[PDB]
Amino acid sequence: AVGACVLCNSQTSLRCGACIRRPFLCCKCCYDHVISTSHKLVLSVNPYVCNAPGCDVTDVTQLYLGGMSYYCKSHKPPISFPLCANGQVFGLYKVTDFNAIATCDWTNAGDYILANTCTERLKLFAAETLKATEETFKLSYGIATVREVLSDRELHLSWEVGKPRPPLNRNYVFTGYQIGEYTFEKDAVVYRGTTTYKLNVGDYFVLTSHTVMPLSAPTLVPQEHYVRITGLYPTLNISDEFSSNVANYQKVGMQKYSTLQGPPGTGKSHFAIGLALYYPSARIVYTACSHAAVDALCEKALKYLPIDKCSRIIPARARVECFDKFKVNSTLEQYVFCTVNALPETTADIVVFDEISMATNYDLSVVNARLRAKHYVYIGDPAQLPAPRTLLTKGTLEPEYFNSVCRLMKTIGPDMFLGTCRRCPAEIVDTVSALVYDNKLKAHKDKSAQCFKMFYKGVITHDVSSAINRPQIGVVREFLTRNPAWRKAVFISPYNSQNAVASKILGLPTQTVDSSQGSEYDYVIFTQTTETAHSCNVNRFNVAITRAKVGILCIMSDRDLYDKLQFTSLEI
Numbered sequence: 001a002v003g004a005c006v007l008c009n010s011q012t013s014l015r016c017g018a019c020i021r022r023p024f025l026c027c028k029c030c031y032d033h034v035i036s037t038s039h040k041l042v043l044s045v046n047p048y049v050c051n052a053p054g055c056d057v058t059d060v061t062q063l064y065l066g067g068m069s070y071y072c073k074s075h076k077p078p079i080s081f082p083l084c085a086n087g088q089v090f091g092l093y094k095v096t097d098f099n100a101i102a103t104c105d106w107t108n109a110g111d112y113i114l115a116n117t118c119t120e121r122l123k124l125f126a127a128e129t130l131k132a133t134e135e136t137f138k139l140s141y142g143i144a145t146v147r148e149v150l151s152d153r154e155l156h157l158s159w160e161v162g163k164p165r166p167p168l169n170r171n172y173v174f175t176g177y178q179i180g181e182y183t184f185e186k187d188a189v190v191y192r193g194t195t196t197y198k199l200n201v202g203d204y205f206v207l208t209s210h211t212v213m214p215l216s217a218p219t220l221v222p223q224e225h226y227v228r229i230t231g232l233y234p235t236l237n238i239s240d241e242f243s244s245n246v247a248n249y250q251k252v253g254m255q256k257y258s259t260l261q262g263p264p265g266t267g268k269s270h271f272a273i274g275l276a277l278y279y280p281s282a283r284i285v286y287t288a289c290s291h292a293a294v295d296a297l298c299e300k301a302l303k304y305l306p307i308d309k310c311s312r313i314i315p316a317r318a319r320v321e322c323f324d325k326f327k328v329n330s331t332l333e334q335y336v337f338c339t340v341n342a343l344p345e346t347t348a349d350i351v352v353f354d355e356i357s358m359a360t361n362y363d364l365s366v367v368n369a370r371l372r373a374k375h376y377v378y379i380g381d382p383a384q385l386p387a388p389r390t391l392l393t394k395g396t397l398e399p400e401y402f403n404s405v406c407r408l409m410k411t412i413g414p415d416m417f418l419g420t421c422r423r424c425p426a427e428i429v430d431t432v433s434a435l436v437y438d439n440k441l442k443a444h445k446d447k448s449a450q451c452f453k454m455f456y457k458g459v460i461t462h463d464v465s466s467a468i469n470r471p472q473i474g475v476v477r478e479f480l481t482r483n484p485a486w487r488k489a490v491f492i493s494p495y496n497s498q499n500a501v502a503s504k505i506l507g508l509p510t511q512t513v514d515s516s517q518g519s520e521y522d523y524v525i526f527t528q529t530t531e532t533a534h535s536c537n538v539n540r541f542n543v544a545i546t547r548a549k550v551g552i553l554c555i556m557s558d559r560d561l562y563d564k565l566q567f568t569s570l571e572i
């Protein structure tokens with residue numbers, strides 16, 4: 001009931017009862033909150049409400065101090081002090097941006113912009129509130145009950161009328177009921193039970209709300225710059241394979257935190273595992289938001305790091321199938337591969353945070369709060385995709401507002417830039433280099449002359465809100481007959497429903513652009529599907545076409561992105 005002020009850090013008992021994270025505000029500022037905002041409830045030991053029986057006045061502006069207790073203008077004694085006056089609110093030890101964070105609903109991009117252009121404690125308040133707000137919204141959705149089970153991987157569902165029905169995708173993980181997490185992919189719909197169990201008629205699923213914990217630690221600890229490699233011990237036998245990264249590996253030592261912008265296929269994974277071989281005594285924790293991104297740093301470790309000092313930290317409530325080749329849940333191994341949401345309380349010589357574009361400031365804080373370390377390494381690309389902000393429906397989130405790392409990368413540059421794409425045909429590298437990397441990204445590979453674009457708007461249908469374009473799938477059918485080499489291509493689109501249909505018609509494996517991020521395939525077929533803000537997002541486009549090692553076919557809906565593709569145009 002006693003704490004410090006989440007603007008100035010002055011000691012107070014004054015929380016805001018109105019704010020969803022009951023923040024401890026100082027007297028001068030708790031005033032400037034309640035007189036600016038609809039927020040009028042103030043707490044301390046006991047609530048600032050009128051003590052007169054049957055009186056409902058809780059607005060601190062309408063309240064007074066009468067002896068030891070509080071009352072309204074209708075109930076105060078003659079000797080009484082107004083709680084709200086002299087620019088302060090009476091409390092123990094006796095802003096715009098703080099108001100906006102407290103009061104906003106997180107449906108606008110300007111709410112996320114502010115939550116990344118503010119002070120560090122506000123960012124934590126913001127991140128807490130947002131996640132808080134995110135969670136409380138999940139309740140508002142309608143339960144889904146199994147009517148009948150068609151087969152092993154399909155069924156039909158009955159919804160609770162009144163409350164809305166959330167969109168069926170691989171982006172909305174339900175909790176079945178306690179028969180493990182499930183998901184839904186396009187009556188006939190698919191039921192993806194992460195735990196193998198015979199689906200019972202009557203049983204229900206719910207979007208379970210993992211409660212928001214408060215944030216102690218900042219997003220970014222303060223930066224520290226040294227004269228020499230503090231706390232680590234470098235070799236000079238570092239295999240030529242990692243010789244390019246030595247000046248940067250030394251930068252990692254002569255700094256507290258370091259930021260690496262690596263465009264697709266420029267050797268992030270390689271650099272991370274290569275930091276262990278250069279500081280080979282060092283205990284390292286490898287962390288990223290997703291099981292896939294951690295499972296990626298595991299594969300690039302199996303190859304170069306001794307398998308005996310590697311533990312894949314699995315959360316005891318196991319989500320989806322994971323990395324096996326390591327010892328499971330050995331916290332104190334030299335090498336620890338763990339999702340941010342499963343990080344144990346520990347310390348380390350180096351922490352590498354990978355896929356930083358996908359980090360929420362929450363995620364940045366949780367990592368700092370579970371890991372005290374000599375050197376923090378933040379690896380990814382603000383030109384790739386951020387974490388989906390499910391409440392955001394109005395405006396676009398620019399990369400300089402993804403989190404504090406991305407904001408740094410976009411304003412004063414990253415510390416270190418991997419400037420050579422080794423994965424992609426030069427047609428792709430040349431395209432994204434101009435589109436999102438101010439031409440600073442260079443192609444190692446030659447043009448493949450296997451990169452094709454076709455402008456074909458086709459016909460957009462919608463399965464609820466997810467888009468389909470059958471004509472664009474029909475153009476890909478025609479192309480596959482004339483290009484049998486592409487029979488092994490991964491089909492990629494910005495939409496699950498399109499993928500659902502292309503699966504059934506083409507027979508190719510299927511991937512949304514967002515789930516393609518971090519992966520690579522010889523041959524990619526991309527149907528843009530629609531001409532929306534979603535399907536024309538330059539970061540999503542960037543990711544989509546930089547999945548390809550050898551060839552890509554882009555069926556485009558957007559003239560601009562179509563013209564920008566430095567590919568051979570096909571005809572039909």
Ligand SMILES: [Zn+2]
Pocket residue numbers: 016017018019033037039102
């Ligand atoms: Zn408030």
Ligand SMILES: [Zn+2]
Pocket residue numbers: 005006007008009010025026027028029030
């Ligand atoms: Zn204050």
Ligand SMILES: [Zn+2]
Pocket residue numbers: 050051052055056057071072073074075
């Ligand atoms: Zn009263």
